[PDB]
Amino acid sequence: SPIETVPVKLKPGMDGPKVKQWPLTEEKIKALVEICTEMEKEGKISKIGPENPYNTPVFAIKKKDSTKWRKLVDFRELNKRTQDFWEVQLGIPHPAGLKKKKSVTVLDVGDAYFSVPLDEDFRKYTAFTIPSINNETPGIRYQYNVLPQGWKGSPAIFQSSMTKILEPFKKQNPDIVIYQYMDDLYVGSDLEIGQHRTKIEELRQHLLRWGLTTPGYELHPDKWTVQPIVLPEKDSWTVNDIQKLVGKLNWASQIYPGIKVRQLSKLLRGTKALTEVIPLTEEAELELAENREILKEPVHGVYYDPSKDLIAEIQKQGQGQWTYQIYQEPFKNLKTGKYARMRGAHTNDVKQLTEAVQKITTESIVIWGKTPKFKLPIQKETWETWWTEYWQATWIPEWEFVNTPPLVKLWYQ
Amino acid sequence: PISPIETVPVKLKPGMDGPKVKQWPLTEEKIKALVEICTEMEKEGKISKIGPENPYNTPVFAIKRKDSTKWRKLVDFRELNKRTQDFWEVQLGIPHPAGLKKKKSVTVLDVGDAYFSVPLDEDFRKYTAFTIPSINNETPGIRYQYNVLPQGWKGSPAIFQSSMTKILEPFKKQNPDIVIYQYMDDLYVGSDLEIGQHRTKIEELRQHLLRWGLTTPDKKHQKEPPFLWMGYELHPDKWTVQPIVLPEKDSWTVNDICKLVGKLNWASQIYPGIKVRQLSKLLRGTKALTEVIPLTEEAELELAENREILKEPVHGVYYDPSKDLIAEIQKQGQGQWTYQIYQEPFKNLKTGKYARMRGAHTNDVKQLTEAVQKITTESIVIWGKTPKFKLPIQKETWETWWTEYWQATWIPEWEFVNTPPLVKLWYQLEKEPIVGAETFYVDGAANRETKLGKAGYVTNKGRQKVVPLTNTTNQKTELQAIYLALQDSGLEVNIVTDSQYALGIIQAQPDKSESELVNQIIEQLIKKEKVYLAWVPAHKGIGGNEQVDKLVSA
DNA sequence: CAGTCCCTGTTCGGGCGCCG
DNA sequence: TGGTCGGCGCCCGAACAGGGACTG
Ligand SMILES: Nc1ncnc2c1ncn2[C@H]1C[C@H](O)[C@@H](COP(=O)(O)OP(=O)(O)OP(=O)(O)O)O1
Ligand SMILES: [Mg+2]
Ligand SMILES: [Mg+2]
């Protein structure tokens, strides 16, 4: 039986994923199980015991109003341990041309991986445990035989046979740039919605009769300008109204080593009343139209170093007011942006912060070919309590939690 | 007897060998029983004798049980475990009466000689080597090894549990309609059949189990309502924790206090509002669990208070999914909180508390949301649903704190419940300078290796002050300073700072902190009817800024 | 730059409780 | 005399961890 289960190993001196599974929902377990049921009946997974000390959290999320749940796993802790099998051996050539695509389309197809038998000597890590309500029964475990969606090598190993499934439509339409991340595939082009959409539907008839299957949907991240660090636009300035735009430009300075201080630092040198109005001279008034030009001029010191991890920071402002801090180093903001709750049913803090962690990453992956390391503004407990609720990203960005006073949020406000 | 179930594969820690520790002598009493057991155990094949070819050995002992002529035979496998590979525990949490749905028919079964019915793998058996001493301290001990999961082996648990689930796998599969709460070897069969048909299925289940080597002796709760299960008492329509006796004593040692808090923590699931803060507080000065510790007033009371609650019998009900799951919570003060979940007023499912003070600078609305999570998580663990809430915090005090806080805090579907002590932000902070208000410029500092430092302010209407601080730090100053700029100011003030440490602290409107000084700032803060607080860079020579530096930099 | 303090969080282990 | 194991909970202490502020 000439198949080819590619051998793989974890980094040197690295055990496997031993991460406790977390609480689910009635609805979530009922589907999460109904799934693994079929999934075993088709040898993708196989029940396993206690003697396998490896575990990864799992859960599901209905999606797109398919009103059909999809199974997902936080292989995060694994991909970190799964050795550079995904790094220094089988990297990914940055198709930087996708930034320009008029209209790109994303479509999950990893649903093909489950036809790619995984190295058995490795399967022992894909172990995930399902729980039961009120702890009626002990954890029902399982393992992976085929390729586990949402994993590092899961896409890497398949890509080879992938590219070869692409040649017919990827060479009869080389104008388009086709990128594959984790499970989702990206097809960015320039055609109009009347045409461009009718074609993604052809790339279907090609991939379904070639194996793969899949059930505003488009994107144009570049078609959206990062909102620069705007300043106030008044015609009278108070003692604080000034001391504020002062301390703001004192920090909004390391982003632009060239930004004027003294002319507006001069307007005060004595203990004055905050209410008091004291407009400016022509030099400090020209500094308002000057240090206001550095804020339309793209910062300089931005080098996308794939050698380091894409970090980010976020901000809670007001009425769906969140802001993008995509950077690789201190003040080295590669790109920044925002996100406001649309003119639809007004949701809540977390519900959005999540989309506003998903949206910001959807781009990070297109504009860079990878995902951030979000510095989160929410509380651990909180995040972990509902985050899983509002998520449809077949992947999971790494992240941390952080609490730090605003007035630093002003600069993006 | 012993089960045909598939044995389980266990290896040892890479490059590690078996135990080789001797048997620390035991009473002429335990030996008498160990020799009375193994006799049977070996006769039943649960253990095979061994000779010189077995290089390993580990000690064992015995235990009596709750009013039982029976002894439990244990093995001090501490060493082996260390050298034994490690498994993934399959026992996720614990079942809870409150998560049981009302059933037409219940039964409870306890598999006999549970572990000893599950076969240990043929290869590993070699390490479970032990030695059973002689009484006349003459004849060299007799040696054996287990052929079944040993009592006290790091792995027995997850294995048994696993082994068990697989044994019931077929029955549950062919009897989808019978709920079977299983915990270790403890079975609770819930059915909606009539006594007739249920008792019949109960036999089927039994025979099945025995046929797989699992005996279900008559220690099987039948028409036993109240059933005894997981430490409760299951009645036809309510349930309750078993007799939970506290220790009445005079002089209290430290673990003693430990047993109390533990128990009261056990009580806290149904007797509502047990409180522990002042008793747990009583256990910070980490010491000997044989060391006498004094009892405080706040403690002494908290004890007797709860001790009373435990006198009035209480109970809880079962779960009905065709009816909303509610949870209400109330403040018990000083950072503590109590709560209950019900579906029908006065007939609640479970009660509980939340006494953890997460942070050093938070308020009640922080501690309230901190609790709403505790309850959701937990709630999902039990009903796999998330409760609607009833909270003692105004429908606005919330639309304030959140739309106003810098973090995205969220609370599920919730209503208001006017039931003091309500929860409300103890004060606000003007987000717009207060006209006609003495504009103070505050700051201070102290020295690294040297003792003191200082802090002070300056008004825009002309006014000067500064104080000599002792043992302070870069922080104990900035704050110590904003403390006076309040008492030394009226209803309307306007302070400013170049620091952010003190800015964020007071940016959360905290009303409770571990640092007395902080409480003093808040304390005053509550008194003033308007206060603004902006920030401007430090050592960047800003108006009214530098003056303050110098006045203190000295 | 560093080497430092302050401070705020986290994580982890330990003890007791409850269950088997 | 005393001593085992696994699960979960509570609380406490210790060891981390990252900022911000200063010193050399
Ligand atoms: N104190 C303990 N130490 C280690 N394991 C225990 C302990 N108590 C219970 N167990 C584990 C091992 C047991 O085989 C299993 C079941 O114990 P249990 O149901 O209370 O009695 P048993 O099944 O060993 O025989 P019996 O039916 O006569 O009570 O749970
Ligand atoms: Mg038993
Ligand atoms: Mg200062």
Side-chain angles (χ1 to χ4, degrees):
Chain A
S1 305
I3 317 170
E4 46 194 64
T5 53
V6 311
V8 192
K9 170 187 176 175
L10 312 184
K11 281 173 290 170
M14 286 217 106
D15 243 300
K18 298 182 175 180
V19 46
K20 293 193 194 64
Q21 160 67 45
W22 28 263
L24 290 235
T25 305
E26 152 138 285
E27 48 159 28
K28 283 184 181 174
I29 291 189
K30 274 179 176 180
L32 200 302
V33 62
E34 191 189 318
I35 287 177
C36 291
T37 276
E38 237 44 283
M39 275 196 80
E40 172 170 48
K41 197 162 307 175
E42 303 155 305
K44 309 190 172 199
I45 44 172
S46 289
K47 287 175 183 173
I48 61 169
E51 76 304 28
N52 174 327
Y54 303 137
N55 196 58
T56 308
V58 12
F59 67 94
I61 32 201
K62 181 169 289 180
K63 162 219 183 175
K64 158 202 74 175
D65 174 82
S66 70
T67 13
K68 280 176 176 177
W69 302 74
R70 184 160 165 292
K71 170 203 175 184
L72 157 60
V73 190
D74 183 64
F75 280 107
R76 280 207 270 119
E77 195 32 51
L78 178 69
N79 300 310
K80 297 193 170 195
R81 301 172 171 287
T82 193
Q83 185 172 56
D84 305 306
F85 160 87
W86 52 288
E87 188 67 60
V88 186
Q89 173 197 172
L90 298 176
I92 257 64
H94 39 303
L98 263 173
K99 315 163 190 178
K100 320 176 177 183
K101 314 285 64 179
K102 293 281 188 176
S103 302
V104 182
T105 314
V106 180
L107 201 57
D108 188 303
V109 289
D111 194 57
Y113 295 153
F114 300 144
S115 300
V116 194
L118 139 55
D119 167 33
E120 186 233 296
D121 206 301
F122 189 60
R123 298 166 168 162
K124 48 177 296 184
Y125 295 108
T126 33
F128 60 118
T129 299
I130 299 184
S132 275
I133 62 162
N134 182 49
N135 273 139
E136 173 172 347
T137 151
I140 295 181
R141 318 199 61 181
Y142 288 96
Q143 262 184 192
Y144 261 127
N145 307 287
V146 295
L147 284 180
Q149 288 184 143
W151 174 48
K152 268 296 160 289
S154 185
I157 308 170
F158 179 59
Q159 156 280 301
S160 294
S161 183
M162 172 56 93
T163 55
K164 299 189 180 181
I165 297 163
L166 301 179
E167 50 153 304
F169 195 114
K170 182 182 188 58
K171 185 60 181 177
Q172 69 95 60
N173 244 102
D175 57 296
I176 304 176
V177 182
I178 274 175
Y179 189 49
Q180 179 187 303
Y181 191 57
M182 243 60 103
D183 314 66
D184 293 320
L185 192 68
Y186 305 150
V187 171
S189 74
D190 298 305
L191 253 177
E192 184 53 60
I193 200 62
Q195 300 63 58
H196 168 58
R197 185 190 289 281
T198 309
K199 188 204 288 184
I200 285 293
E201 179 225 48
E202 300 195 75
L203 174 49
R204 303 197 81 283
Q205 306 313 75
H206 191 67
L207 302 181
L208 71 74
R209 285 313 162 187
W210 259 68
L212 333 183
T213 304
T214 308
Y217 302 73
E218 351 299 301
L219 269 183
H220 334 290
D222 176 61
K223 199 177 176 309
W224 186 23
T225 298
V226 302
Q227 189 183 306
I229 173 166
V230 67
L231 296 164
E233 183 178 54
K234 280 190 173 184
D235 34 8
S236 301
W237 309 80
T238 60
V239 169
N240 82 300
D241 190 350
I242 293 175
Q243 294 168 291
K244 278 188 179 305
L245 185 48
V246 161
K248 167 197 171 179
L249 290 148
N250 151 53
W251 258 72
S253 63
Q254 298 86 207
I255 178 67
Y256 299 100
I259 201 166
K260 299 299 178 181
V261 42
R262 267 296 175 293
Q263 258 307 305
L264 280 167
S265 170
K266 197 170 186 178
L267 288 80
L268 59 168
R269 204 158 186 175
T271 63
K272 280 294 182 181
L274 300 171
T275 316
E276 190 202 75
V277 185
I278 63 163
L280 355 59
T281 45
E282 274 192 295
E283 307 87 279
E285 201 64 295
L286 182 59
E287 196 180 70
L288 165 57
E290 192 194 64
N291 289 315
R292 182 179 170 302
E293 272 312 305
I294 328 178
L295 314 186
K296 269 189 296 297
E297 171 60 52
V299 55
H300 279 186
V302 302
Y303 64 119
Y304 169 36
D305 177 29
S307 170
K308 195 56 191 173
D309 308 307
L310 269 170
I311 306 182
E313 294 191 311
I314 230 172
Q315 283 85 204
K316 171 178 168 64
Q317 303 288 40
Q319 185 171 62
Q321 233 60 62
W322 313 82
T323 55
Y324 294 33
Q325 241 84 302
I326 311 167
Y327 69 70
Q328 289 187 294
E329 274 299 63
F331 312 97
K332 299 288 186 175
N333 282 54
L334 324 190
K335 166 179 167 58
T336 70
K338 71 164 194 172
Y339 180 65
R341 171 183 66 71
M342 35 259 77
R343 194 180 56 166
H346 70 152
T347 53
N348 65 64
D349 299 289
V350 301
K351 178 166 185 184
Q352 312 183 311
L353 204 172
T354 286
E355 310 157 295
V357 157
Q358 288 198 176
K359 273 299 178 61
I360 155 180
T361 305
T362 303
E363 314 177 312
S364 190
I365 294 174
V366 198
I367 299 177
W368 274 277
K370 38 186 288 190
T371 55
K373 192 289 176 68
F374 296 60
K375 303 259 294 178
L376 289 175
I378 230 165
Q379 285 305 338
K380 195 187 179 191
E381 326 313 312
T382 316
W383 183 239
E384 285 173 284
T385 297
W386 299 273
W387 84 264
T388 75
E389 281 293 305
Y390 326 100
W391 188 290
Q392 285 88 305
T394 75
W395 32 275
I396 297 171
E398 214 295 316
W399 65 50
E400 56 178 63
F401 301 113
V402 64
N403 79 317
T404 50
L407 206 60
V408 299
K409 307 198 164 194
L410 265 55
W411 325 344
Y412 302 80
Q413 201 171 307
Chain B
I2 196 164
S3 186
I5 195 196
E6 287 207 295
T7 171
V8 174
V10 306
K11 305 191 176 70
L12 281 190
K13 295 275 191 177
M16 273 252 78
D17 199 11
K20 293 182 176 180
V21 41
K22 182 52 185 182
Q23 189 72 54
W24 23 273
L26 319 175
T27 86
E28 167 175 299
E29 171 196 56
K30 297 186 180 180
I31 298 183
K32 273 189 172 183
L34 279 93
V35 169
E36 173 182 59
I37 292 176
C38 302
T39 280
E40 186 64 42
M41 212 148 118
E42 178 247 312
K43 187 285 179 180
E44 301 182 311
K46 319 265 187 182
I47 57 172
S48 296
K49 299 194 180 188
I50 56 171
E53 62 307 300
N54 195 309
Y56 330 90
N57 181 278
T58 143
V60 304
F61 51 136
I63 308 180
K64 289 288 291 178
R65 294 163 51 170
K66 281 293 191 180
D67 187 58
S68 201
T69 328
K70 196 167 252 179
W71 290 77
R72 174 161 275 131
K73 177 178 172 294
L74 303 188
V75 189
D76 194 330
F77 279 119
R78 278 182 305 188
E79 251 308 75
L80 169 63
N81 316 306
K82 276 190 175 179
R83 312 190 182 178
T84 299
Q85 79 154 85
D86 42 58
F87 328 63
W88 175 253
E89 230 59 60
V90 53
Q91 182 61 78
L92 312 210
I94 289 181
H96 197 223
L100 302 160
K101 280 165 191 142
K102 174 53 181 296
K103 284 287 187 164
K104 181 77 131 304
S105 294
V106 179
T107 300
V108 176
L109 312 169
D110 186 350
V111 185
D113 302 292
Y115 277 15
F116 300 178
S117 295
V118 194
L120 182 59
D121 110 298
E122 172 95 56
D123 302 308
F124 202 93
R125 292 168 158 176
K126 305 157 191 171
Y127 311 110
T128 62
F130 64 107
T131 295
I132 290 210
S134 184
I135 182 51
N136 50 126
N137 292 292
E138 188 174 349
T139 309
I142 317 168
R143 320 181 72 232
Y144 315 84
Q145 53 173 56
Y146 280 53
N147 299 301
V148 300
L149 290 164
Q151 207 130 170
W153 178 47
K154 209 224 296 186
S156 297
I159 279 176
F160 185 95
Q161 314 183 296
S162 188
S163 294
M164 170 70 67
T165 309
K166 190 190 170 188
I167 300 200
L168 303 147
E169 192 175 333
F171 186 80
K172 269 183 183 167
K173 184 192 170 194
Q174 196 188 304
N175 289 295
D177 311 291
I178 297 173
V179 154
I180 297 188
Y181 269 72
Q182 66 164 105
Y183 186 64
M184 193 64 79
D185 78 335
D186 211 42
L187 298 206
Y188 160 129
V189 166
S191 146
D192 238 284
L193 292 159
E194 305 302 355
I195 288 190
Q197 310 163 58
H198 174 149
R199 263 95 177 312
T200 326
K201 276 295 181 183
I202 230 70
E203 192 53 25
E204 292 181 43
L205 177 55
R206 270 175 77 171
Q207 282 183 305
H208 170 65
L209 284 158
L210 159 50
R211 203 172 318 150
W212 272 87
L214 290 197
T215 67
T216 57
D218 307 53
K219 162 195 199 175
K220 82 169 241 57
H221 287 238
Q222 281 182 296
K223 182 66 182 195
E224 249 97 309
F227 293 74
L228 289 196
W229 175 69
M230 293 301 96
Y232 298 100
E233 233 156 57
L234 303 177
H235 291 124
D237 287 303
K238 71 181 180 179
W239 63 264
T240 169
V241 335
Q242 305 191 47
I244 157 190
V245 171
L246 289 196
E248 179 154 57
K249 66 165 59 281
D250 25 55
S251 59
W252 299 75
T253 79
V254 177
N255 70 44
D256 261 304
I257 306 301
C258 268
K259 274 195 179 182
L260 266 55
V261 193
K263 299 208 168 193
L264 285 134
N265 262 294
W266 177 222
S268 44
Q269 72 186 317
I270 213 47
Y271 286 92
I274 300 290
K275 21 196 173 185
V276 273
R277 183 71 75 196
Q278 304 303 303
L279 212 41
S280 82
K281 171 201 68 178
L282 179 51
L283 289 185
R284 314 190 163 183
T286 38
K287 277 293 181 183
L289 284 63
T290 60
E291 166 185 296
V292 167
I293 184 173
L295 295 171
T296 107
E297 192 183 65
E298 299 61 32
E300 276 294 26
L301 307 211
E302 166 187 294
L303 164 94
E305 279 193 295
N306 297 322
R307 188 169 288 175
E308 259 300 285
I309 309 181
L310 302 176
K311 298 192 175 181
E312 55 170 52
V314 295
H315 68 58
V317 203
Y318 299 125
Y319 181 75
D320 178 4
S322 84
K323 202 173 295 174
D324 277 303
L325 185 65
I326 308 304
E328 181 182 323
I329 164 187
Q330 317 95 51
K331 177 188 185 176
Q332 266 239 291
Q334 54 187 303
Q336 327 204 57
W337 303 62
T338 311
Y339 70 110
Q340 38 294 297
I341 311 168
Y342 57 96
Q343 299 176 290
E344 278 304 331
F346 297 135
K347 289 193 172 180
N348 45 356
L349 295 102
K350 181 195 192 306
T351 47
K353 58 166 182 167
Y354 181 173
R356 200 198 165 206
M357 298 194 113
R358 260 218 312 175
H361 303 313
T362 68
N363 59 69
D364 283 358
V365 169
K366 278 168 175 276
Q367 295 186 301
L368 176 59
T369 37
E370 283 181 359
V372 184
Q373 280 123 63
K374 175 54 188 176
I375 304 181
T376 323
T377 275
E378 187 188 313
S379 156
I380 319 188
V381 184
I382 289 169
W383 296 289
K385 194 180 192 180
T386 175
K388 291 186 175 186
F389 288 82
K390 271 181 155 190
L391 306 179
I393 173 185
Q394 265 293 357
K395 206 56 193 274
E396 302 186 315
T397 323
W398 185 246
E399 251 231 301
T400 286
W401 170 274
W402 84 278
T403 186
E404 302 290 301
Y405 197 62
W406 64 83
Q407 298 176 180
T409 284
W410 191 59
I411 281 186
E413 187 185 318
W414 80 300
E415 319 158 312
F416 178 50
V417 61
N418 188 49
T419 172
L422 289 194
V423 104
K424 60 192 60 175
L425 312 178
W426 266 175
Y427 61 54
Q428 274 305 298
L429 280 197
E430 307 280 307
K431 277 300 174 184
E432 175 58 54
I434 310 174
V435 184
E438 187 170 51
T439 303
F440 294 68
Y441 276 63
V442 62
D443 186 33
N447 186 64
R448 286 200 143 197
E449 324 176 327
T450 65
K451 288 300 174 191
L452 297 65
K454 45 177 169 178
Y457 59 66
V458 302
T459 69
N460 71 302
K461 89 164 190 174
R463 185 176 185 176
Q464 182 168 50
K465 179 176 185 173
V466 285
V467 187
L469 327 192
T470 304
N471 294 297
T472 181
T473 57
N474 263 57
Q475 300 91 315
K476 271 202 163 71
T477 59
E478 182 68 65
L479 300 169
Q480 169 65 70
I482 309 189
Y483 165 50
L484 307 175
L486 301 171
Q487 45 189 299
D488 284 45
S489 63
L491 289 182
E492 296 183 60
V493 196
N494 265 284
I495 308 179
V496 64
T497 189
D498 66 355
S499 185
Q500 281 177 298
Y501 170 72
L503 169 69
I505 284 187
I506 304 188
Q507 180 57 84
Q509 325 175 188
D511 34 53
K512 298 183 170 184
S513 174
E514 329 192 312
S515 161
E516 170 177 52
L517 188 176
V518 196
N519 282 298
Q520 298 179 294
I521 302 175
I522 321 173
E523 167 193 296
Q524 291 294 307
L525 290 162
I526 297 175
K527 303 182 182 180
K528 303 310 180 296
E529 296 308 299
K530 269 185 178 173
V531 166
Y532 177 70
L533 191 70
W535 168 74
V536 277
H539 281 50
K540 291 290 199 293
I542 293 190
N545 147 283
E546 312 184 304
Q547 292 97 302
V548 199
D549 283 301
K550 313 183 178 187
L551 312 193
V552 198
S553 56

